[PDB]
């Protein structure tokens, strides 16, 4: 019961976002991943933000 829920916001202008979990005690660094943005239909980079 330590992993907090986070959201990954797309770097594109669209407000689309994914949601996942994260252990903020062991991994304080922000999570950045390349995920598919269904609004622009491209693989852009997604950065972490608060749920």
Partner 1 sequence: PKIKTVRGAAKRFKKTGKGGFKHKHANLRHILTKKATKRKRHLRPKAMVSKGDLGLVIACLPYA
Sites of contact with partner 1 (CB under 8 A): 5, 19-21
Which of 12, 28, 35, 47 is close enough to bind RNA by CB under 7 A?
35
Q: How many residues bind RNA (CB under 7 A)?
A: 26
| Contacted entry of partner 1, RNA, none for residue 27, CB cut-off 5 to 8 Å set by kind | RNA
Measured in whole angstroms, how far is the alpha carbon of residue 8 from the centre of its chain?
2
19 binds RNA, rule: CB under 7 A: yes
């Amino acid at each position: 019961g330590i992993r907090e829920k986070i959201k990954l916001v797309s770097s594109a202008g669209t407000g689309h976002f994914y949601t996942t979990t994260k252990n903020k005690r062991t991994k304080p660094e922000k999570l950045e991943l390349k995920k598919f943005d269904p609004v622009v239909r491209q693989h852009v980079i997604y950065k972490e933000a608060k749920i």
